[PDB]
From a paper:
In addition, we refined a cocrystal structure of isolated HIV-1 IN CCD dimer with our lead compound BDM-2 to 2.0 Å resolution. While the latter structure clarifies the interactions made by BDM-2 within the principal INLAI-binding pocket on the HIV-1 IN CCD dimerization interface, the cocrystal structures with the two-domain construct additionally visualize the key INLAI-induced CTD-CCD contacts. The contacts made by all compounds within the CCD pocket are very similar, regardless of the IN construct used. The INLAIs are anchored through hydrogen bonds with main chain amides of Glu170 and His171, and additionally with Thr170 side chain. In addition, the INLAIs engage in extensive hydrophobic interactions with IN CCD residues Leu102, Thr124, Thr125, Ala128, Ala129, Trp132, Ala169, Gln168, and Met178. In particular, the tert-butoxy groups of BDM-2 and MUT871 make van der Waals contacts with Thr174, explaining why a substitution to a bulkier Ile residue at this position causes high-level resistance to these compounds. Thr174 makes hydrogen bonding and van der Waals interactions with the tert-butoxy moiety present in BDM-2 and shared by all potent INLAIs reported to date. A larger Ile side chain in position 174 is expected to clash with the tert-butoxy moiety explaining the loss of compound binding. Of these, T174I is the most detrimental, leading to a substantial loss in the antiviral activity of BDM-2. In contrast to full-length HIV-1 IN, which forms stable tetramers, isolated CCD is only known to dimerize.
Numbering used by the authors:
A (entry chain A), B (entry chain A): 57 to 137, 154 to 188, 194 to 208
């Protein structure tokens, strides 16, 4: 279903990478955050929900979503309730950039543009077809 | 044309808001940054280019794009070279959030979802039709 996203954090070089996957397409958005806090998750959810029609979010660590701030973001935005493949690409490009966050965005770019159509093409088509 | 984006910064409460507009659709993405630096622009461009097929970027301040770092981001990602309407929405929601960045993302959400189809629906349809 086109409104379903998966959200998890993974750890690399002492930092935290927030990873959202549009399950139907494999399309990813990621951000490096200082550490795993409800406030960072909430803010990320608000950002994500303004870009895509986010209906439901799943996670592999349900305690991620217990904070008052996360609950508020989901309430306002109308939301109801690959780490290895992305880490692979990050490793392939890591030497080309100083900052981990730079390498993360290169890896998201490479993943979303890779033809199996690409994840970036699939999400756009899935969402348009739903309209 | 579906690959064209506009990128500018605007100022509010002593902070800097980076605003990207998909010109064909009116769809917006925004981020609050500390101040206007080439590095922040470069990083934003890398993020944007992994989400959408960004072909060309325009700006109203051409000196925005002179830094070595911006040029590198455009090179790697294959890129070649409303402030009032968004400030209006930010003012309408500003009291509901502590942080300006939170109010900015609420305003992006409201803008992209507003039916004139919405900007969010238009960009997804324009991009899918181009495929
Ligand atoms: C810190 C820094 C300094 C200089 C550059 C470019 C040669 C000028 C880049 C950079 C700029 C763009 C770029 C890549 C690297 C690698 C390929 C993708 O595009 C970065 C970069 O940090 C940001 C925050 C992005 C400026 C990094 O972490 O090394
Ligand atoms: C700093 C802070 C504290 C508490 C909350 C929620 C009641 C718990 C929110 C919040 C959380 C979600 C939310 C809105 C506000 C307003 C409507 C949209 O959704 C924020 C918030 O900061 C972030 C970084 C987002 C946590 C802010 O700037 O006030
Ligand atoms: Mg997690
Ligand atoms: Mg500007």
């Amino acid at each position: 279903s086109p409104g379903i996203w998966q959200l998890d954090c993974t750890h690399l070089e002492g930092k935290v990478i927030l990873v959202a996957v549009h399950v139907a397409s494999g399309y990813i958005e990621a951000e490096v955050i200082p550490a795993e806090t409800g406030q960072e998750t909430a803010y990320f959810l608000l950002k994500l929900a303004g870009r895509w029609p986010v209906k439901t979010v799943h996670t592999d660590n349900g305690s991620n979503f217990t904070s008052t701030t996360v609950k508020a973001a989901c309430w306002w935005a109308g939301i109801k309730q690959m780490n290895k493949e992305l880490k692979k690409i990050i490793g392939q490009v890591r030497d080309q950039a100083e900052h981990l966050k730079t390498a993360v965005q290169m890896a998201v770019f490479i993943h979303n543009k890779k033809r199996k159509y690409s994840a970036g093409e699939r999400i756009v088509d899935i969402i348009a077809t739903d309209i």
